[PDB]
């Protein structure tokens, strides 16, 4: 017994599309992760609502969803809609719309249950022999960025969620925010930086973040910076995904492409053309939590992480593992 979901992951930078065979044995691959970078929180963080064109943007690859969906049989499809959706005062008018063009209302859901299932979609598939439990995924998006760790598997299962907490920093609202200008200044720098790390004060309240032996990156942000990192001309997710990443390597790469101007980062085609403008914003919070989880472990166990492992598979993965499994019951 086996039921084929759908499911579709509208972040604040893009929206992606997935469909998949889910039993016991985890999840098949039918189609593999369409991305289209439609920027629907464009500007929401001082707006508070979408534009017309984000919407519109937004319809069209909806559009095209339906038709690739259509070119197979569902027994279901989930739409999530996270940030973005969230933040936005005109969000019924858009899940009215996405309603009349896919046949499913989306689904605003909470920033931990983002995490929760992120945190499923990324730790689902890693390997036991290579990876050292507590896990602590990383999802940095465009409007939110999530912390969630697991258990060490001694005390608590390696699979269940500890602690959880989706702070509303990202690397669209980041940029937005502070890195006003071509190339940003160290003065906005300064301010992102701050802005940041209040946000991981209150993040570190509630997850023991410090209890990680592993950190797992994953979305956007986090596997640009890697495929930056190991030189690739041009985009490649099978050479990306499980990736160690050294801390060194990625604060290099955080902070030249931080600083860089945005006709520069054109020059490196591996940065797919819609995160050219955020990549920024990506960057510092990406180092941040990086030296703050770092800094929580030394003073937790005495260790200080001085890598990570760069994933391909986060709130999506989650997505369709989830509803699948939930279909194998009901």
């Given at each position: 017994?086996?039921?084929?979901?759908?499911?579709?992951?509208?972040?604040?930078?893009?929206?992606?599309?997935?469909?998949?065979?889910?039993?016991?044995?985890?999840?098949?691959?039918?189609?593999?992760?369409?991305?289209?970078?439609?920027?629907?929180?464009?500007?929401?963080?001082?707006?508070?609502?979408?534009?017309?064109?984000?919407?519109?943007?937004?319809?069209?690859?909806?559009?095209?969803?339906?038709?690739?969906?259509?070119?197979?049989?569902?027994?279901?499809?989930?739409?999530?809609?996270?940030?973005?959706?969230?933040?936005?005062?005109?969000?019924?008018?858009?899940?009215?719309?996405?309603?009349?063009?896919?046949?499913?209302?989306?689904?605003?859901?909470?920033?931990?249950?983002?995490?929760?299932?992120?945190?499923?979609?990324?730790?689902?598939?890693?390997?036991?022999?290579?990876?050292?439990?507590?896990?602590?995924?990383?999802?940095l998006?465009?409007?939110?960025?999530?912390?969630?760790?697991?258990?060490?598997?001694?005390?608590?299962?390696?699979?269940?969620?500890?602690?959880?907490?989706?702070?509303?920093?990202?690397s669209?609202?980041?940029?937005?925010?502070?890195?006003?200008?071509?190339?940003?200044?160290?003065?906005?720098?300064?301010?992102?930086?701050?802005?940041?790390?209040?946000?991981?004060?209150?993040?570190?309240?509630?997850?023991?973040?410090?209890?990680?032996?592993?950190?797992?990156?994953?979305s956007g942000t986090v596997?640009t910076m890697?495929?930056?990192?190991?030189?690739?001309?041009?985009?490649?997710?099978?050479?990306?995904?499980?990736?160690?990443?050294?801390?060194?390597?990625?604060?290099?790469?955080?902070?030249?492409?931080?600083?860089?101007?945005?006709?520069?980062?054109?020059?490196?085609?591996?940065?797919?053309?819609?995160?050219?403008?955020?990549?920024?914003?990506g960057?510092?919070?990406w180092?941040?939590?990086?030296?703050?989880?770092?800094?929580?472990?030394?003073?937790?166990?005495?260790?200080?992480?001085?890598?990570?492992?760069?994933?391909?598979?986060?709130?999506?993965?989650?997505?369709?593992?989830?509803?699948?499994?939930?279909?194998?019951?009901?």
């Amino acid at each position: 017994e086996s039921v084929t979901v759908a499911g579709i992951d509208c972040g604040t930078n893009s929206i992606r599309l997935k469909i998949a065979r889910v039993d016991a044995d985890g999840m098949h691959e039918v189609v593999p992760r369409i991305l289209r970078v439609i920027r629907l929180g464009q500007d929401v963080d001082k707006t508070h609502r979408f534009a017309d064109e984000a919407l519109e943007r937004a319809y069209v690859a909806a559009r095209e969803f339906a038709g690739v969906i259509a070119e197979h049989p569902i027994d279901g499809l989930r739409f999530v809609a996270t940030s973005a959706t969230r933040d936005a005062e005109n969000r019924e008018e858009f899940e009215d719309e996405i309603e009349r063009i896919l046949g499913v209302r989306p689904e605003v859901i909470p920033g931990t249950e983002e995490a929760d299932l992120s945190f499923l979609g990324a730790t689902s598939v890693v390997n036991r022999d290579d990876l050292p439990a507590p896990y602590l995924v990383v999802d940095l998006g465009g409007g939110s960025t999530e912390l969630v760790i697991g258990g060490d598997g001694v005390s608590a299962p390696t699979t269940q969620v500890q602690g959880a907490f989706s702070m509303n920093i990202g690397s669209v609202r980041m940029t937005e925010r502070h890195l006003t200008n071509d190339p940003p200044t160290q003065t906005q720098i300064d301010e992102a930086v701050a802005d940041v790390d209040e946000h991981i004060d209150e993040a570190f309240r509630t997850v023991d973040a410090g209890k990680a032996r592993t950190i797992i990156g994953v979305s956007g942000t986090v596997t640009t910076m890697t495929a930056l990192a190991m030189g690739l001309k041009e985009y490649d997710h099978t050479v990306v995904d499980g990736h160690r990443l050294s801390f060194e390597d990625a604060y290099a790469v955080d902070d030249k492409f931080l600083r860089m101007t945005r006709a520069e980062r054109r020059e490196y085609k591996t940065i797919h053309p819609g995160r050219i403008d955020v990549v920024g914003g990506g960057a510092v919070v990406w180092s941040r939590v990086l030296a703050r989880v770092s800094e929580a472990a030394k003073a937790d166990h005495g260790e200080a992480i001085d890598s990570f492992v760069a994933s391909e598979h986060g709130l999506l993965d989650g997505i369709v593992l989830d509803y699948g499994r939930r279909l194998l019951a009901q």
